[PDB]
Amino acid sequence: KAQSKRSGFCGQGTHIVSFVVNAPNGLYFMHVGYYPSNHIEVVSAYGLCDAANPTNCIAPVNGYFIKTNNTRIVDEWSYTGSSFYAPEPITSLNTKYVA
Amino acid sequence: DVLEQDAQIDRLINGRLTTLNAFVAQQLVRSESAALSAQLAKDKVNECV
Amino acid sequence: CNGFQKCEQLLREYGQFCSKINQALHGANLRQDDSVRNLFASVKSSQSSP
Amino acid sequence: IAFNHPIQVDQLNSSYFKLSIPTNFSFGVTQEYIQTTIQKVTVDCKQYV
Amino acid sequence: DDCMQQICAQYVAGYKVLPPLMDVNMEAAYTSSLLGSIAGVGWTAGLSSFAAIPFAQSIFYRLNGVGITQQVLSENQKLIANKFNQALGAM
């Protein structure tokens, strides 16, 4: 019916879609599953503190390529962040970074 | 006495075969239960861990 | 049998039943090995930190 | 022997945390068979036994 | 050989127990890989990406979202790590 969490019930890899077809004494399926394939190691920053409470959440996604401060989604190189995180300021441990 | 052996082997083989069949059946039931348990363990690592 | 020649010849008549018993146990052992491989495969395939 | 070694991401003492990022979509995977039902059959006492 | 220096196994040879497809070291390596990966997968990384975050940060993130305790309230709470250590010590 819909995309499902990776509890192993769905096919290995992130589940995008599943199709079911009749099989003798049972059921058979048709599918597409996302696989990362290639991994690049990039250090990720935690916002900035130029003045008072300028710290922001990294994003709904964990990714935050350091860049100049650009946010990153799950895959590929960083794109100019445009309020993708959309977060009201929160108290942050340390200085200059949320960490 | 071969005839004495034939009477003795009859009961002995029938008992040995039935117990061996029971041992195989017990192993198969344990194997099926273990396979279901392995699936639950896979789900447990996928979710709780 | 304890290796008695007479016992083995008597077993030859019932040999087919003995072969079926051995095959069934072999199938169970192979299934247990397959289940172990599937479980461990789910555990691995992650970018673990050292 | 098989090493079966996983990818290693070094933990960082500094506030910044290292990240692993996918580059290729590589969509697609195999399928599994449920075996929902077994063959349906009825024996006859006169024919068999 | 141990049969020669005296669950029968080789003794009657009615049967045999077979080795379990994996040495203890290989099984331990799989558990060790799972332990290291636990912190990264939890912080919204799924399987597509991994985050190299400390165990303390991962515990704090789980504690923050589920309960009212958050950043400042969580930092105000003290000996939370000690309570976790005491429970592990009881085990």
Write out chain A residues lying below 8 Å of B44, CB-based. none
Among residues C6, C30, A49, A95, the alpha carbon closest in space to that of B6 is found at: C6
Contact B31 C32 (CB under 8 A): yes
Give the integer Cα–Cα distance in Å for A75 and E45: 11
Among residues A27, E52, A18, C4, the alpha carbon closest in space to that of D29 is found at: A18
Give the integer Cα–Cα distance in Å for B18 and E58: 57
Among residues A11, A1, A92, the alpha carbon closest in space to that of A47 is found at: A92
D29 interfacial to chain E (CB closer than 8 Å): no
Resolution, angstroms, 1 dp = 2.8
How was it solved? cryo-EM
Q: Residues D28, A11: contact at Cβ < 8 Å?
A: no
A60 Cβ contact partners less than 8 Å away, ≥ 6 residues apart: A84, A85, E44
Give the integer Cα–Cα distance in Å for B39 and C39: 7
Contact A8 C42 (CB under 8 A): yes
Element (H, E) at C28: helix C15-43
Please name the amino acid found at residue E31: T
Give the integer Cα–Cα distance in Å for E9 and E13: 6
- Judging contact as 3 or more Cβ pairs under 8 Å, the answer for D and B is no
Residue with tokens 């959440």: A57
Among residues A25, A36, A30, C36, the alpha carbon closest in space to that of E23 is found at: C36
Q: In this complex, which of C10, C17, C24 lies closest to B28 when CB atoms are compared? A: C24
